[PDB]
Design a binder for these strands. Structure first.
Ligand SMILES: Nc1nc2c(ncn2[C@H]2C[C@H](O)[C@@H](COP(=O)(O)O)O2)c(=O)[nH]1
Ligand SMILES: [Ca+2]
Ligand SMILES: [Ca+2]
Ligand SMILES: [Ca+2]
Length: 341
DNA sequence: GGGGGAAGGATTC
DNA sequence: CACGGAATCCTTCCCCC
């Protein structure tokens, strides 16, 4: 099996650059303004000009502005980026019908048929890179290997605007030398749990008693890491299906007042329903981000579809359940609809 | 003992 | 100071054969 992974470079910001080319070369910072106070919020993404100075996704807009006061700061326009993304995905869809659209800027291609051996794969990558740059003016990084995980890792090592192949020889080299934190799906939480078990490299997972691994990071994650170390990971390429649609907003002030939170919750509901399409959900969850950035939620699954009236009514009950069972003041509030009919 | 949901939380990107 | 949005996974609880 030959997997070719495509990852769009600093996507949101690059799109802004495409829509306003005079931005090229300047530090571009795409932000999610929360509205709590001037420049409150965080960086969704930044181009490399900004990233080389420390301005990257996750940092407060206020911090970024202290580092780069003269950079271009733009509000995130999700809808625009999503339409551009869809156009790029269709284009790849013609390089294979075996495609996995992992996110707004990542897709995996099973080019096991369209090619044989890594020479042609690499050639096909450049074809894809040049095609996308040509038709959309978007640069992307291509990663190629035997499975999804190493194809992605390949891209992680080649970005930005690169292409790379990890063949059956390097895979083994990485299995013992690749820092395990750099393995997809291994975040900071898991990375630390594995460090405490003496696991710093993928191969170390084979020196531990499985039942201990399972105990520490869960069975799924355990089998995942073990399979990769045995050089046996081989999940198939297939675009998952949207299983949930939702919206969460930040209130001006943290609150615990119902009549004060509602308008936010209802706005969340209104946007969620618009996003729903003609999809009808049978489950609804109210999600609240507490004052100490803790996430709490209460939901309910109905034996039938939820109309917007029912959603408005149930959400209030769920919200009251949250306020009732959690003392902290509330900072962000939203809803999520799932179990579509 | 264990299938099958549902619920609330934990994690990742 | 720290936004969002969604998928997996986990663990707990529950009904019940
Ligand atoms: N809103 C938001 N989006 C992010 C963050 N990190 C990455 N992304 C998005 C940018 C796009 C996609 C690229 O991969 O991931 C983040 O911290 N906040
Ligand atoms: Ca990516
Ligand atoms: Ca990217
Ligand atoms: Ca990591």
């Amino acid at each position: 099996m030959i997997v070719l992974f495509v990852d769009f470079d600093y996507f949101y910001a690059q799109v802004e650059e495409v829509l306003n080319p005079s931005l090229k070369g300047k530090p571009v910072v795409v932000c999610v303004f929360s509205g709590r106070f001037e420049d409150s919020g965080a960086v969704a993404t930044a181009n490399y000009e900004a990233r080389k100075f420390g301005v990257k996704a996750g940092i407060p807009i206020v911090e970024a502005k202290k580092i780069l006061p003269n950079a271009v700061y733009l509000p995130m326009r999700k809808e625009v980026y999503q339409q551009v993304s869809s156009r790029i995905m269709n284009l790849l869809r013609e390089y294979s019908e075996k495609i996995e659209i992992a996110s707004i800027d990542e897709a995996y291609l099973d080019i096991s048929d369209k090619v044989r051996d890594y020479r042609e794969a690499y050639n096909l990558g450049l074809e894809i890179k040049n095609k996308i740059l040509e038709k959309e003016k978007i640069t992307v990084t291509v990663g190629i290997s035997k499975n999804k995980v190493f194809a992605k890792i390949a891209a992680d090592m080649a970005k930005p605007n690169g292409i790379k192949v990890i063949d059956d020889e390097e895979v083994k080299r990485l299995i013992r030398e690749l820092d395990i934190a750099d393995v997809p799906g291994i975040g900071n939480i898991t990375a630390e749990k594995l460090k405490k078990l003496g696991i710093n490299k993928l191969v170390d997972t084979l020196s531990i008693e499985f039942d201990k691994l399972k105990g520490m990071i869960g069975e799924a994650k355990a089998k995942y890491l073990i399979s990769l170390a045995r050089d046996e990971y081989n999940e198939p390429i297939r675009t998952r299906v949207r299983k949930s649609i939702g919206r969460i907003v930040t209130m001006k002030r943290n609150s615990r007042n119902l009549e004060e939170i509602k308008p936010y919750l209802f706005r969340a509901i209104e946007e969620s329903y618009y996003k729903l399409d003609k999809r009808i959900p049978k489950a609804i969850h109210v999600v609240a981000v507490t004052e100490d950035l803790d996430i709490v939620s209460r939901g309910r699954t109905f034996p039938h579809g939820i109309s917007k009236e029912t959603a408005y009514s149930e959400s209030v009950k769920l919200l009251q359940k949250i306020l009732e069972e959690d003392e902290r003041k509330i900072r962000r509030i939203g809803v999520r609809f799932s179990k579509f009919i």
